[PDB]
Amino acid sequence: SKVSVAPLHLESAKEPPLNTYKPKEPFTATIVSVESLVGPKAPGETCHIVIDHGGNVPYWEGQSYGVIPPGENPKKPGAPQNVRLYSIASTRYGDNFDGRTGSLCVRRAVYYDPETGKEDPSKNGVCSNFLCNSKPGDKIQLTGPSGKIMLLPEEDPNATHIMIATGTGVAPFRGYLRRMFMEDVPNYRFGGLAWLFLGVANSDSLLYDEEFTSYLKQYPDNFRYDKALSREQKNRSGGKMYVQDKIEEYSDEIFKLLDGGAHIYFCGLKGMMPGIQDTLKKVAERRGESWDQKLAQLKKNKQWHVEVA
Ligand SMILES: Cc1cc2nc3c(=O)[nH]c(=O)nc-3n(C[C@H](O)[C@H](O)[C@H](O)COP(=O)(O)OP(=O)(O)OC[C@H]3O[C@@H](n4cnc5c(N)ncnc54)[C@H](O)[C@@H]3O)c2cc1C
Ligand SMILES: NC(=O)c1cccnc1
Ligand SMILES: [Mg+2]
């Protein structure tokens, strides 16, 4: 039924690891695999990178790894490159179920001249292309792990978790959902509701869709999954279908779940948040509620979890 994971001593630590490796002495990890997650119509490549850390850089679900790309710091001669953070997309056991690997979900940052569409190697994103250009056996300078905002609250195994992602913001939720549904973790038997909302540009830009869809058939009473394909669908007002439009489609259900104590999570590019806030204010107003009052309450109750950049 559930997949055996090892070693179960990874459940014993009472606190998440933080800054085990630091930039001046990173951990030299080894690439296991790199693959594209997306199809030909996707605006850009997003890749799935599996990294062998040998058990030397454990983490909890929701944390980030740092990666120091090669080369000198362009603004600090003689110095290494600045760390880039990546949300870990794997559980603490990893994609090999052995506690030795972790995975990243990385969008290639590529520069196009806004008029001609021409390229320029010196303007592409350094660390994202480094990662998606990697091959098995390549070495990676790893730092961290870091972050606590997106730790999964496990005190109540029957909690409700409403997960709102755009693009690579799905990464921590892939980790959450594997821990909730896929892996045999005897000390955490999830029996609540986990509701994943994912916005991407088009069907070819979907990330891990087969995995999430499988949870609908395995855990129909504990998982829901809704997608917004912005260039392929339009909202009720003529706009491109964004994730906030999908929340709006379920406004009454979601607001009732929040009032009942649900956690809600937001992850991805910071550009996703203004439209979400606009939708939530409009929804609140139609219900005769104040979104300001409601958000202040959610934050005070520690139901509101945002990590965007
Ligand atoms: C907590 C956290 C978690 C994150 N999680 C993820 C994740 O899971 N996945 C993910 O893909 N990203 C994630 N990010 C973003 C990630 O950390 C990087 O910032 C991103 O990958 C870009 O880094 P880079 O080294 O590729 O680009 P950089 O080399 O830092 O360049 C940044 C941008 O500037 C552009 N640029 C460079 N030079 C020029 C120029 N001369 N003219 C115009 N433009 C230029 C680049 O093309 C790029 O878009 C996260 C960020 C944070 C803070
Ligand atoms: N955790 C983050 O801030 C994040 C994740 C994915 C993409 N961009 C930022
Ligand atoms: Mg696909």
Side-chain angles (χ1 to χ4, degrees), residues 1-13 15-233 235 237-309:
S1 190
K2 288 186 187 275
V3 174
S4 295
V5 290
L8 283 172
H9 70 242
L10 294 185
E11 301 295 320
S12 296
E15 293 291 299
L18 291 175
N19 301 121
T20 316
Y21 291 87
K22 299 153 181 196
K24 292 169 200 158
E25 298 290 346
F27 180 77
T28 300
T30 304
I31 300 283
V32 180
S33 61
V34 174
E35 306 290 339
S36 174
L37 292 165
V38 301
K41 293 189 204 185
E45 185 194 12
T46 300
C47 68
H48 190 78
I49 308 129
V50 181
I51 299 165
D52 182 349
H53 64 87
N56 296 287
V57 202
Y59 52 89
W60 288 12
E61 292 76 18
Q63 299 194 283
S64 294
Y65 274 155
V67 176
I68 295 167
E72 85 174 326
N73 190 327
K75 311 196 85 63
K76 207 172 174 175
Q81 300 260 27
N82 299 143
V83 173
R84 279 76 162 162
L85 297 169
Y86 294 93
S87 299
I88 298 163
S90 46
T91 75
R92 67 187 70 194
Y93 301 99
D95 294 351
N96 203 33
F97 308 112
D98 63 0
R100 299 188 84 258
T101 80
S103 300
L104 310 175
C105 180
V106 177
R107 176 63 179 270
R108 280 198 195 256
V110 183
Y111 175 85
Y112 301 101
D113 179 82
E115 287 261 334
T116 58
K118 287 187 162 122
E119 295 181 301
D120 182 340
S122 79
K123 300 190 180 178
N124 286 357
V126 174
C127 197
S128 63
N129 286 281
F130 168 65
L131 292 164
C132 291
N133 286 338
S134 290
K135 299 293 189 180
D138 282 350
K139 303 310 188 191
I140 297 307
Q141 300 293 99
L142 268 180
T143 65
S146 61
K148 291 188 293 199
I149 287 174
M150 303 295 286
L151 298 176
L152 180 64
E154 295 180 2
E155 295 70 37
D156 171 7
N158 299 316
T160 294
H161 300 285
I162 304 167
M163 310 171 184
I164 312 301
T166 58
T168 56
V170 76
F173 307 140
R174 176 174 185 275
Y176 291 2
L177 290 167
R178 280 193 170 215
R179 180 168 174 82
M180 291 166 181
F181 297 126
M182 183 186 287
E183 297 177 332
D184 190 18
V185 179
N187 55 290
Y188 185 69
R189 305 299 199 191
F190 181 68
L193 168 68
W195 195 343
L196 174 62
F197 291 78
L198 176 65
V200 296
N202 56 23
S203 55
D204 269 7
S205 302
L206 281 167
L207 309 177
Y208 312 112
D209 184 53
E210 303 88 340
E211 181 153 308
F212 300 140
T213 295
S214 77
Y215 294 143
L216 288 171
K217 299 211 189 63
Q218 299 171 21
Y219 292 92
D221 209 41
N222 305 89
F223 181 66
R224 298 168 73 162
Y225 178 37
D226 291 280
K227 289 167 272 183
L229 310 179
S230 67
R231 302 182 184 195
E232 189 165 320
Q233 309 163 336
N235 58 46
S237 303
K240 298 201 302 187
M241 186 63 150
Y242 288 108
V243 81
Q244 59 268 28
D245 304 313
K246 274 283 165 198
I247 293 163
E248 186 174 341
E249 181 176 342
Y250 298 97
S251 56
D252 189 47
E253 290 201 74
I254 286 163
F255 268 52
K256 285 174 177 23
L257 286 174
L258 292 173
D259 290 347
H263 294 274
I264 187 162
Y265 307 79
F266 303 86
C267 194
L269 297 182
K270 64 177 173 192
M272 67 189 279
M273 295 305 296
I276 290 169
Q277 295 288 350
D278 292 339
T279 289
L280 290 171
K281 175 171 181 282
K282 169 185 70 178
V283 169
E285 195 278 345
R286 281 196 288 262
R287 300 170 60 80
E289 308 187 61
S290 162
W291 176 244
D292 290 338
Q293 176 278 336
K294 205 158 199 70
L295 177 58
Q297 182 180 301
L298 290 171
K299 285 191 169 195
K300 188 176 191 183
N301 292 352
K302 305 196 175 190
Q303 292 172 262
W304 184 268
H305 315 285
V306 183
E307 205 172 49
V308 302

